[PDB]
Amino acid sequence: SVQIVYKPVDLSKVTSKCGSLGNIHHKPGGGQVEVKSEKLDFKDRVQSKIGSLDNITHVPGGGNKKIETHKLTFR
Amino acid sequence: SVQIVYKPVDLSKVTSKCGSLGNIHHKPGGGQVEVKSEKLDFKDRVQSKIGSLDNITHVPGGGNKKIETHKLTFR
Amino acid sequence: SVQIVYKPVDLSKVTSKCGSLGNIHHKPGGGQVEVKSEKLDFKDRVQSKIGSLDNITHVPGGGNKKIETHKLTFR
Amino acid sequence: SVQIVYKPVDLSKVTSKCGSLGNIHHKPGGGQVEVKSEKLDFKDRVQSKIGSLDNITHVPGGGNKKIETHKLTFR
Amino acid sequence: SVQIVYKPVDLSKVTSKCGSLGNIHHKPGGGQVEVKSEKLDFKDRVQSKIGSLDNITHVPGGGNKKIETHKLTFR
Amino acid sequence: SVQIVYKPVDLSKVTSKCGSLGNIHHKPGGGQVEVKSEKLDFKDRVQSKIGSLDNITHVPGGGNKKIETHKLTFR
């Protein structure tokens, strides 16, 4: 009496070519950091970070993404 | 009596060529940071960061994305 | 008695060529930063950041996106 | 009583920077050279140079001298 | 009593920068050269140069001298 | 009483930086050279040089001298 057919089809490409990929950092400086605290009070958690230089460097040789999500649902 | 036929089709391309890809950072300075605090009262969570230089560098050799979502739903 | 047929078709391209792709940061300066606080009160979560130079650099060798959403829905 | 205190402070910098130094993406490119020579007669000294590119950096200068003299004398 | 104090402070910078220094994307491009020579007679000294690009940098100068004398004397 | 105190302080810097130094992506490129010679007669000394690229760096200079004298004398 009833049929439900979920037959989606994906042939897609997510692609790259690239030549030379380069990153250079040449001398960065984090300068002086100074902190002074007196009579502070806290009543739920403290999350902290202190520092002269914070660096993140992500250099993927193709950083390509495919996200697919499929739902068949009854509620 | 009833049929439901979910048959979408995807041949799509998301693509790049590239020659040389380069990034240069040449010398940045974060200058002096100074913080002074007295008698602060905090009643819920504290999330903090202090610092002279904060760098994020992201250099994907092709950073291409495909996002697709498919729903067949009854409620 | 009833049929519903969902057959969309996608042949799309989203594409790039490129020659040389280059980014140069040459010497930036974050100047001196100073903060003073006295007798502050806080009653819900506090999110803070202090710093002389904050840099983000995203340099994709082709940063192409395809976003598609397909819904068949009964409620 | 008598007190004599000779205490000069030198924190000076004397700096020389000569020649090519901090260039970024310097790409000197010499094109094609052709020499065809026929039936030439040389009756005295020949000094000959042929070529696409000379990329010479040449520094007879850039030298420093610091001369500094100190005297304390009672006579 | 007598108190004599001699305490001069030198923080001076003497700096020389000569030549090419901080250029970005310097791309000198020498064209094609052709020399055809036939039946030339040289009865005396020949000095010859042929070429597409002379990317010479040359620094006889840019030297420094600091001369500085100090004297405290009682006579 | 008598007190004599000779305490000059030297923290001074003499620096020379000469020649090629801190270049990034320096890519000198000498193109093709061709030399054809026929029936040339040389009756005296020949000095000959052929090539695509002379990437010479040459530093007769960049020397330092610091001359620095101290005298304390009673006579």
UniProtKB/Swiss-Prot annotation, chains A, B, C, D, E, F:
Highest taxon, organism lineage: Eukaryota
Consequence when changing residue 48 to L: In fatal respiratory hypoventilation; unusual apparent autosomal recessive inheritance; reduced binding to microtubules as well as increased fibrillization and aggregation
Residue positions, PTM Omega-N-methylarginine: 45
Tissue expression summary: Expressed in neurons. Isoform PNS-tau is expressed in the peripheral nervous system while the others are expressed in the central nervous system.
Glycosylation sites: 43, 49, 65
Role, per record: Promotes microtubule assembly and stability, and might be involved in the establishment and maintenance of neuronal polarity. The C-terminus binds axonal microtubules while the N-terminus binds neural plasma membrane components, suggesting that tau functions as a linker protein between both. Axonal polarity is predetermined by TAU/MAPT localization (in the neuronal cell) in the domain of the cell body defined by the centrosome. The short isoforms allow plasticity of the cytoskeleton whereas the longer isoforms may preferentially play a role in its stabilization.
Domain free text: The tau/MAP repeat binds to tubulin. Type I isoforms contain 3 repeats while type II isoforms contain 4 repeats.
Full protein name: Microtubule-associated protein tau
Organism: Homo sapiens
